[PDB]
Amino acid sequence: DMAFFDNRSAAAAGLAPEIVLYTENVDLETPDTHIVYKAGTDDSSSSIN
Amino acid sequence: TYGNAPVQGINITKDGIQLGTDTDDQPIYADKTYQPEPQVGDAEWH
């Protein structure tokens, strides 16, 4: 799905996309590396992660 | 002074940087003779 963005500082009356991101779920794997630091036990997508 | 201060604290008062907390819930300040340690810092870029 596409996600559109404008500057946080843009005028609300003249909003239009400056960036579009094509967002997707994929089958993400790490066949040959492992996590050596994360902040806690949670492995969900999150700001800290 | 010039440099950087890498050890993040819970707070800073006249007793120095608070590094932790008691089982009595009271602040634990750095022991100045060895804390804060120059080798320690935030563990991620974020």
CB contact under 8 A, B43 and A39: yes
Experimental method: X-ray
Entry resolution (Å):
2.1
Residue A17: count of CB within 10 angstroms of its CB: 11
Chain B residues with beta carbon closer than 8 angstroms to that of A35: none
**Rounded to whole angstroms, how far apart are CA atoms A1 and B31?**
54
Residue A45: count of CB within 10 angstroms of its CB: 6
**Rounded to whole angstroms, how far apart are CA atoms B30 and B40?**
13
Three-state secondary-structure class, residue A19: strand
Three-state secondary-structure class, residue A6: coil
**Rounded to whole angstroms, how far apart are CA atoms B25 and B33?**
24
Question: Which residues touch B29 (CB under 8 Å, ≥6 apart)?
Answer: B13, B15, B16, B17, B18, B19
Contact B45/A at CB under 8 A: no
